[PDB]
Amino acid sequence: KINWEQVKEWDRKYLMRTFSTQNEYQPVPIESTEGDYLITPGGTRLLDFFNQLCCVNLGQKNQKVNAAIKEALDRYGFVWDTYATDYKAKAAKIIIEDILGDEDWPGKVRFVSTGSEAVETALNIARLYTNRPLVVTREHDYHGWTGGAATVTRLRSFRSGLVGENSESFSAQIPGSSAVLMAPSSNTFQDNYLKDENGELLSVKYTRRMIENYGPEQVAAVITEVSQGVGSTMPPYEYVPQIRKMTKELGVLWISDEVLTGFGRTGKWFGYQHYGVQPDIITMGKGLSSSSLPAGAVVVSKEIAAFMDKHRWESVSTYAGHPVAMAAVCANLEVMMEENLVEQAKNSGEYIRSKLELLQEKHKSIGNFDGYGLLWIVDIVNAKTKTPYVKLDRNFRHGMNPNQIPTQIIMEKALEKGVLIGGAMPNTMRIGASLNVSRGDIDKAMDALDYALDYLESGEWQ
Amino acid sequence: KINWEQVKEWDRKYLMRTFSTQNEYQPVPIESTEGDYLITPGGTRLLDFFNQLCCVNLGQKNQKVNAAIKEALDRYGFVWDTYATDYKAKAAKIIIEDILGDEDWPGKVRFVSTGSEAVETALNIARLYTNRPLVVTREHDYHGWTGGAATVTRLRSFRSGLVGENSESFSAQIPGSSAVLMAPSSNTFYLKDENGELLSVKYTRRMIENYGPEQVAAVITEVSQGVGSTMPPYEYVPQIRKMTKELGVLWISDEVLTGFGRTGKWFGYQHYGVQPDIITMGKGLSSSSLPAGAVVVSKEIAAFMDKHRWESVSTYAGHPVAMAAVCANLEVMMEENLVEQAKNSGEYIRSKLELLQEKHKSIGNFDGYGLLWIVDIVNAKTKTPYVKLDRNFRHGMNPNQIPTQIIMEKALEKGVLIGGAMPNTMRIGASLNVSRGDIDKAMDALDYALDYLESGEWQ
Amino acid sequence: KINWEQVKEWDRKYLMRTFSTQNEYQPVPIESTEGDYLITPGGTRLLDFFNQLCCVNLGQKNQKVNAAIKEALDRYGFVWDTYATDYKAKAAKIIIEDILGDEDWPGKVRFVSTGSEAVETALNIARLYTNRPLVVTREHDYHGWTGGAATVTRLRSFRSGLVGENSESFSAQIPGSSAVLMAPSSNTFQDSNGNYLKDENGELLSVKYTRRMIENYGPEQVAAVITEVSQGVGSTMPPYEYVPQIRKMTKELGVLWISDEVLTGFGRTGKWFGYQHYGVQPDIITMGKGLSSSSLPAGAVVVSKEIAAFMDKHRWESVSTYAGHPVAMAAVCANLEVMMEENLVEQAKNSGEYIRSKLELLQEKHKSIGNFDGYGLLWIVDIVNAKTKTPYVKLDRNFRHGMNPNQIPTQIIMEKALEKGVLIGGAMPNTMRIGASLNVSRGDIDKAMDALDYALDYLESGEWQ
Amino acid sequence: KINWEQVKEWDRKYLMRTFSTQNEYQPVPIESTEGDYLITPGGTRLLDFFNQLCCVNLGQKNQKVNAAIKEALDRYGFVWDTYATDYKAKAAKIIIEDILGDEDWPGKVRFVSTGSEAVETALNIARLYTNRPLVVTREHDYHGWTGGAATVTRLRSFRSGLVGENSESFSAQIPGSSAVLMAPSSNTFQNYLKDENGELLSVKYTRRMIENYGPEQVAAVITEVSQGVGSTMPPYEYVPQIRKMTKELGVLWISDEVLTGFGRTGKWFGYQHYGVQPDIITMGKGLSSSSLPAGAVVVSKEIAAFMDKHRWESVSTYAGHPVAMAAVCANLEVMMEENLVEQAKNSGEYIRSKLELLQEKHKSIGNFDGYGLLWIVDIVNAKTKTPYVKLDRNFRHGMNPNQIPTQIIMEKALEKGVLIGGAMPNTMRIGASLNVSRGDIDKAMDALDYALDYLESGEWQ
Numbered sequence A: 001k002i003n004w005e006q007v008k009e010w011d012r013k014y015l016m017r018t019f020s021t022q023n024e025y026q027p028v029p030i031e032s033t034e035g036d037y038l039i040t041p042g043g044t045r046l047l048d049f050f051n052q053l054c055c056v057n058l059g060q061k062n063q064k065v066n067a068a069i070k071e072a073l074d075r076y077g078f079v080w081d082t083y084a085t086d087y088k089a090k091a092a093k094i095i096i097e098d099i100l101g102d103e104d105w106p107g108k109v110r111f112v113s114t115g116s117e118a119v120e121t122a123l124n125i126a127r128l129y130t131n132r133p134l135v136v137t138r139e140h141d142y143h144g145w146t147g148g149a150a151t152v153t154r155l156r157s158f159r160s161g162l163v164g165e166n167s168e169s170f171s172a173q174i175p176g177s178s179a180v181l182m183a184p185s186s187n188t189f190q191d192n193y194l195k196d197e198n199g200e201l202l203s204v205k206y207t208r209r210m211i212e213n214y215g216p217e218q219v220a221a222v223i224t225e226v227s228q229g230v231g232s233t234m235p236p237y238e239y240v241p242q243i244r245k246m247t248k249e250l251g252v253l254w255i256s257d258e259v260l261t262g263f264g265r266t267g268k269w270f271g272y273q274h275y276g277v278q279p280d281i282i283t284m285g286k287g288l289s290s291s292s293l294p295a296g297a298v299v300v301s302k303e304i305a306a307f308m309d310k311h312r313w314e315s316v317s318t319y320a321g322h323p324v325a326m327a328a329v330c331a332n333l334e335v336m337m338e339e340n341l342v343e344q345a346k347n348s349g350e351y352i353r354s355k356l357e358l359l360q361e362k363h364k365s366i367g368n369f370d371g372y373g374l375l376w377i378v379d380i381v382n383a384k385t386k387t388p389y390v391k392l393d394r395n396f397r398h399g400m401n402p403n404q405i406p407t408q409i410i411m412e413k414a415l416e417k418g419v420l421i422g423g424a425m426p427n428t429m430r431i432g433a434s435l436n437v438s439r440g441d442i443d444k445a446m447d448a449l450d451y452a453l454d455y456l457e458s459g460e461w462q
Numbered sequence B: 001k002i003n004w005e006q007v008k009e010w011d012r013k014y015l016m017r018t019f020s021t022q023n024e025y026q027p028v029p030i031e032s033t034e035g036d037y038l039i040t041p042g043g044t045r046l047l048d049f050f051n052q053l054c055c056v057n058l059g060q061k062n063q064k065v066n067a068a069i070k071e072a073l074d075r076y077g078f079v080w081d082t083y084a085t086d087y088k089a090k091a092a093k094i095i096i097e098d099i100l101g102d103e104d105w106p107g108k109v110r111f112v113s114t115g116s117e118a119v120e121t122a123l124n125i126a127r128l129y130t131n132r133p134l135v136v137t138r139e140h141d142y143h144g145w146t147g148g149a150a151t152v153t154r155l156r157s158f159r160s161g162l163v164g165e166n167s168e169s170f171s172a173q174i175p176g177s178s179a180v181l182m183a184p185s186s187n188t189f190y191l192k193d194e195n196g197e198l199l200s201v202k203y204t205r206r207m208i209e210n211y212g213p214e215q216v217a218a219v220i221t222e223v224s225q226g227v228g229s230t231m232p233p234y235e236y237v238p239q240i241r242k243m244t245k246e247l248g249v250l251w252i253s254d255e256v257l258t259g260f261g262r263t264g265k266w267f268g269y270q271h272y273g274v275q276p277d278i279i280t281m282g283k284g285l286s287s288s289s290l291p292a293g294a295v296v297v298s299k300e301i302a303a304f305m306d307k308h309r310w311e312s313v314s315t316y317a318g319h320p321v322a323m324a325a326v327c328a329n330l331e332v333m334m335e336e337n338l339v340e341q342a343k344n345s346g347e348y349i350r351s352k353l354e355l356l357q358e359k360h361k362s363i364g365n366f367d368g369y370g371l372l373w374i375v376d377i378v379n380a381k382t383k384t385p386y387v388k389l390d391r392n393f394r395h396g397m398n399p400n401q402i403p404t405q406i407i408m409e410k411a412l413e414k415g416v417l418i419g420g421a422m423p424n425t426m427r428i429g430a431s432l433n434v435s436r437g438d439i440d441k442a443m444d445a446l447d448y449a450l451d452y453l454e455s456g457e458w459q
Numbered sequence C: 001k002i003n004w005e006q007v008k009e010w011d012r013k014y015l016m017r018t019f020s021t022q023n024e025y026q027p028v029p030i031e032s033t034e035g036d037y038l039i040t041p042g043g044t045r046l047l048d049f050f051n052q053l054c055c056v057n058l059g060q061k062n063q064k065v066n067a068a069i070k071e072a073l074d075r076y077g078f079v080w081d082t083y084a085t086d087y088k089a090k091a092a093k094i095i096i097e098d099i100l101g102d103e104d105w106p107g108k109v110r111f112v113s114t115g116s117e118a119v120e121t122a123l124n125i126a127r128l129y130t131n132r133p134l135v136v137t138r139e140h141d142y143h144g145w146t147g148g149a150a151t152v153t154r155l156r157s158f159r160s161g162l163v164g165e166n167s168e169s170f171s172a173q174i175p176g177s178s179a180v181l182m183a184p185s186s187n188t189f190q191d192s193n194g195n196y197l198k199d200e201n202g203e204l205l206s207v208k209y210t211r212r213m214i215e216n217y218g219p220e221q222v223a224a225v226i227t228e229v230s231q232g233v234g235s236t237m238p239p240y241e242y243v244p245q246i247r248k249m250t251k252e253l254g255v256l257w258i259s260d261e262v263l264t265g266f267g268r269t270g271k272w273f274g275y276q277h278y279g280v281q282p283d284i285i286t287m288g289k290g291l292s293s294s295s296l297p298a299g300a301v302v303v304s305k306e307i308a309a310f311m312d313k314h315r316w317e318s319v320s321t322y323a324g325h326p327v328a329m330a331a332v333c334a335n336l337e338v339m340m341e342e343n344l345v346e347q348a349k350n351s352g353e354y355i356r357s358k359l360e361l362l363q364e365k366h367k368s369i370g371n372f373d374g375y376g377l378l379w380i381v382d383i384v385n386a387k388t389k390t391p392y393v394k395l396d397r398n399f400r401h402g403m404n405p406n407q408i409p410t411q412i413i414m415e416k417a418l419e420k421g422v423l424i425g426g427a428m429p430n431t432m433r434i435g436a437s438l439n440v441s442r443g444d445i446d447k448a449m450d451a452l453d454y455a456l457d458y459l460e461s462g463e464w465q
Numbered sequence D: 001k002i003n004w005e006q007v008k009e010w011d012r013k014y015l016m017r018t019f020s021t022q023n024e025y026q027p028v029p030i031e032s033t034e035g036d037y038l039i040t041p042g043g044t045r046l047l048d049f050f051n052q053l054c055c056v057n058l059g060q061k062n063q064k065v066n067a068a069i070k071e072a073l074d075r076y077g078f079v080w081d082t083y084a085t086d087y088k089a090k091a092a093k094i095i096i097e098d099i100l101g102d103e104d105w106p107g108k109v110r111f112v113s114t115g116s117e118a119v120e121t122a123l124n125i126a127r128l129y130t131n132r133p134l135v136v137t138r139e140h141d142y143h144g145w146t147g148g149a150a151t152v153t154r155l156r157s158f159r160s161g162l163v164g165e166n167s168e169s170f171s172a173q174i175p176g177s178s179a180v181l182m183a184p185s186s187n188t189f190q191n192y193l194k195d196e197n198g199e200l201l202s203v204k205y206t207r208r209m210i211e212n213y214g215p216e217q218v219a220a221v222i223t224e225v226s227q228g229v230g231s232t233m234p235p236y237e238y239v240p241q242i243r244k245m246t247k248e249l250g251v252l253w254i255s256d257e258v259l260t261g262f263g264r265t266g267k268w269f270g271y272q273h274y275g276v277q278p279d280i281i282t283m284g285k286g287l288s289s290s291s292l293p294a295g296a297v298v299v300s301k302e303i304a305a306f307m308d309k310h311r312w313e314s315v316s317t318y319a320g321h322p323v324a325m326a327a328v329c330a331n332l333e334v335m336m337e338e339n340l341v342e343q344a345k346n347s348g349e350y351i352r353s354k355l356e357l358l359q360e361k362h363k364s365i366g367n368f369d370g371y372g373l374l375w376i377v378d379i380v381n382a383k384t385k386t387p388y389v390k391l392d393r394n395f396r397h398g399m400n401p402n403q404i405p406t407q408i409i410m411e412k413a414l415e416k417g418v419l420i421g422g423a424m425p426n427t428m429r430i431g432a433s434l435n436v437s438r439g440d441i442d443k444a445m446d447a448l449d450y451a452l453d454y455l456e457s458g459e460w461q
């Protein structure tokens, strides 16, 4: 017997709040999950189209994955990275030989526990490989929350600072918070994205002038999200190819931060593979294990691997490569390959596109949408004016009243229909589900969006 | 059927090395673990007196922990911090109400995944609460490897930099590795004030005063230095808590290593009659069964954070299956009284170490509590350490010149794993429930290893 | 009777080089100066159309300025800024009531010794006033060489690093070199034909991106934007609407505007200060060069009444030994008293108009002159390959000094002009930075332009290759 | 005919305040200066035992230095650093061959306008030469107010921050105020504690700090041989041990001689009391005896050679200012010719003995030390034998000056005609011209005697 009133009391009383003050907070307990659904203590089933944080690629509580964890618990236990296990070595091989086997740039994997720890590892390797201090990031990027990963995060609403409750008054960012350069977002400069008559996007051209103003000899790496997860954008098609050609011409590394866009999320194994370019470093988390257990990774190129191999690297993480986490990655990745979830995700994206077309023609509050596989960004506008309700947009902070935030009104409304859908940004949806989400579930979720958008466009909420 | 020949191949070929070059590296496979033992694929049983990284407090592969986990897998799944679950809520309650119940300073918990992450969170909170930029650390502290945690880590041999193979020439720290003051180690100077204050504390005070207390958020300590391998003078901890209070600065006690029974008490600081403002946790929190880390803050600090919206997310923070593993691990320590058992075993080790120091002039000094012991190693004839740079070394030097490496190699001939990170200093640990027989086996193997050290044949 | 050969040995032997290796170094001694001329020990008279560093506004060795200095020496000696003197008090008053008397935003002045120290001061003041850490600068700005001033300098060719002798393998910046944001230059985001791009709302994309940058970090994090009205060392002229758009953007974002007026200040641009061409007023001005026309070392910062009242409420724990030096102050008094009464600002205006019509003619004649713009005694000329119509030096303002001077058009031009006894050129590889005294003659202008003609002839024969 | 009533109004109204709020401030004008005297508008003669800022070594308005300037003004005008002048060349030559001519380490000079600009330069050169980022400084050092020079200043009362007026409420340092490590002050750990090997614990801890970071990370240690603003004297072994330590660690030593340079201490330079030689010297103050603003840096032959192989991309407009250099030459030619260093040693040995007597006569002098025309005097409470102002060199100017012993001595001294006192609250920093007369030294020393009389009676409380 679980006493759920008591669980809520303890949860109020003994856990530090994130995003809500204690005063406004209402615990939302989840007793179990499976597939694309969350089950409340009462037995209510909630369709999860945030997919938590787009990190449960394979589906909640996969039967093969759980079984593989249970088998792994017959042997382990725990050993640190200095010891070898079948699970750690198999997971590395699966990534290099099976998943990325058709590309010849990958050299080696390091496993860690979180996407943040992943981005920390890759910034560290990039600076050591080039012997250079500076790393370029882009406006609105999110690469993590930990010190180093946070320095390349350029959302002021996600930097572990503090805001007040429906107020501008009580805000601070963490005091003292660098060896980092902010380049233009892929979505900056558009009136249709502006180019320079050689065809280079103005976001890329001024990224190049920045790197040249500092000196390419000072700059280790450019770190990108192919599509911004928390920041919620899709790039112009030429953007990724152009950042790759630029970085190569400048002798600078390219790190694709694949924590969110990795493992089938975009109808391909990785976000980058949509554009015909290969990176120098990849960071991983989320879909790596489909959140069955905490895991993160970085893959480096042969050349970087060869350089690192020549020295003793004085770096230790206690839980890096934890064998039970690794067995989980093995099973997750094995299910993905044998069940063709990358293709399944691809086909389901195409079904989503066409629902999104139908909704756009019905709802003038949908300013625009794009995405692929199971990653969709939907831009919301005021239907009469065609412009964003919330002026600061991706530069907002959480100090504002949630019932003025369009993605919040939508989420509240969708909920009347057992569906969870919304976004991190105020004017933008970030829709994700499992790669194997069923058609009836997309149908239910799109219908709930339809019902919410009605309410939004009606104005009864102002 | 596991092909271990292959596994080592895949291990050589596709995983990045740490602490070894590719050319020197040889895979050391471990097929399974049980208790205080590790088992090789061929079936050699290795007695683990590292306790990996002093982080398997419960014993390896606890059947009750493993069953509690298997159970949580019937329901889960994954929900991020925004969702409440029984395991996350129970876990916080056990720490606040159950483990820390007789202390009234603690307020709330945040769960994260690793000790480094816990340290990041503590740094953030401290700076946020005080509205101040600077954090004080001490020489030879280890607080983790990620960005923020690294800045307060003062071991040049564990900052994720690069060294060569048996060579002084291929060295580098990470380019651009800043809101952080390094104070002296407790093990410095034992000289005092005549108003009785240790000089190390006095100068730490004088530091905070030179920048100005209004600039300084927090002093972060390890009660006993873990990777750095020290024990303090008894007076160090209370005089820090007092100095920080007087100047209105926070004290974070970094209990990632010393926490959950390691020292014969629930926490390292509990040996010293003081309460911290903030504590960081990992390792023994889940006994490494699954990746978990935590921060406990005071009622004062928690109340303050509670008035604000905190714009921080970590995907895996509060992972319900990790939290189920924490619940069980903690429930086992409480019901088996293992903190008590750690204290009692610690006293047996003290007396065993005495017979060693008596039998071996290369043991310069030792000290510890529960299942954490630092043994200082010296040249039996000169009575000084073998490796001159001591805790300021880097891993560029040849391991056949590092006493603690020589000790491990020899100890291994007895099937025992014992040694340390530091070149002249041992860090000995085992499970809270290590039996008298295993302690005996490890100390015997230590005997044999120091026998080899003192003969100087390794030169 | 000076031994100038020994002066040459000693200069070679005991002075640290700047911009040259010891081996390539050939000292150029100057025995004296007068007006717009430099005079060698042997008696070569060199027409100085660099005006040294756009810093000798009044002219070299003005007799009244030097006589005022000589007079000051019957009294001083030295006192530090804790004592008041007539000279310091007059200087501040001339700046506030007389020069800036038509504008009502100005509050107080603090004097220092250099333009760098002036920028340091301003940066300190803005951050204290706002209680915010970040300062926004621009691409290719130069704001000085000292610690803080350097951080807002975005020229990798002038951040006090080291390059090689016709090589970039020796090449290093100062290790370490930080609460600064780099905004796009006024001159970034122009098409292949030179039009600056605009919002369709009319806002220059450069300003639009600057705003976006500020809102990304949060305006509560940002103290000030520091600008040059006209980039001096970087050698640019803005679109007319840039200066007004930045003032309006800073106002809206609650951020300060610092006009770095060290080079463009005091007549340089045919008005008292650069910003007065643009119908806006800054929060803080930094000053130097033309403040004393280099007669003695002198820097300054002017701050608004609001900033002044706030700083007045507090004890400021800042000391600089030489700040306010009475003899340097007396030099500013005389310098400024001459500029006012000889109408040198109005004079500067009129000369520039004449220069414009000279360079118009030089452009019609020389296809290597891609473009030019300036005002008063500050002019920029972009140089191109007459044939390809692009600049010869592809890295442009992101170059460093490791490259071979005989491939730098601005070096070749300078060489050739020296054949006509004329000193002219630029710090940037593709762009000339022309300045003389505010009172230069028509003939000395004609003499400079003719040499530029001659130089451009040689540039176009390509024989320098 | 100057209207000094107008000079005051304009001074109050148009000058930014330092150290004083607009409300409390009252202008102290100085109409002329001569030798060791300052002259007010009304004709009052103030004997200056601060020597302004220990920066007018030669004496105020030296008639020879002043005439040299006038001569230079017959020819200049202004040239920047790329053009060679007789004055700039002679000044560097005087410094290297005549002044430092008995030590064979000094290589090249760069002239700048201020002491801070001189420190900036040194830091830049040290980091470039070693290709290392970190500079070690010491608790209570003062090395300037400009960006880089401020990073190595460790006195919170001099970091260009703001405090309130008799109040703890309105204080702030600059947002942003970093590649610098602060090592213990020479005067930390006191008899100063030593190593079992004789090494001072302050030096021992500096070494372990550099070793903790890695000597391969550390460009240089910058010191004041004797702390100026900070107001201290080192134990005799400190300077030699820091010199030995830096060499042992492959690390540069910057002697900041901005204050202690050019005779101040009864030798040419502060370090020269100690039998060692720095890798770099920074200079200001005594360089021109403040006749016109100058600063300079002197580097070793090794450092010079490395610099000479490169094009250095550094420009300072007034660096090398030709009139500033003619001021410098004449200043140095007078110092060498009047044997000012030797004169200074001698007046130092006279002052030592005057202070001794003052110490016998006054229990509030806890301690004194110095040399030449630089003397530090530790002011203590006669009853407890401890300092009046507990935060001592870690204070800030937010406190009421009527409670600062150095403010009290000052105002009572001003009653006898003599400006004497110091920057630190419990420490006097006494300086005069190198050619200060015996009569003036006697007069100042009486004035201190009179002042300490008032301090010790405690009517000020």
Ligand SMILES: Cc1ncc(COP(=O)(O)O)c(CN[C@@H](C)C(=O)O)c1O
Binding pocket: A053, A054, A114, A115, A116, A117, A119, A142, A143, A144, A145, A225, A229, A230, A257, A258, A259, A260, A261, A285, A286, A424, B313, B314, B315, B316
């Ligand atoms: C691209 C990217 N990199 C790195 C991270 C950090 O990974 P961890 O959360 O495992 O530390 C995230 C997390 N995102 C979450 C916050 C999201 O999608 O809302 C991410 O999307």
Ligand SMILES: Cc1ncc(COP(=O)(O)O)c(CN[C@@H](C)C(=O)O)c1O
Binding pocket: A316, A317, A318, A319, B053, B054, B114, B115, B116, B117, B119, B142, B143, B144, B145, B222, B226, B227, B254, B255, B256, B257, B258, B282, B283
């Ligand atoms: C006191 C302390 N804090 C923080 C950490 C870092 O925690 P994670 O490894 O979970 O990030 C450690 C780890 N130490 C390890 C390296 C050891 O004991 O060898 C530690 O001892």
Ligand SMILES: Cc1ncc(COP(=O)(O)O)c(CN[C@@H](C)C(=O)O)c1O
Binding pocket: C053, C054, C114, C115, C116, C117, C119, C142, C143, C144, C145, C228, C232, C233, C260, C261, C262, C263, C264, C288, C289, D315, D316, D317, D318
């Ligand atoms: C806009 C601007 N700000 C600040 C400075 C720094 O002033 P000082 O050099 O006096 O410290 C300069 C100088 N420039 C010079 C060097 C030039 O035009 O070459 C400048 O042009």
Ligand SMILES: Cc1ncc(COP(=O)(O)O)c(CN[C@@H](C)C(=O)O)c1O
Binding pocket: C319, C320, C321, C322, D053, D054, D114, D115, D116, D117, D119, D142, D143, D144, D145, D224, D228, D229, D256, D257, D258, D259, D260, D284, D285, D423
């Ligand atoms: C040792 C030292 N270095 C560097 C400086 C900076 O020089 P400038 O003030 O010219 O920039 C000083 C000045 N000090 C003054 C403030 C004093 O004696 O109190 C100094 O004493």
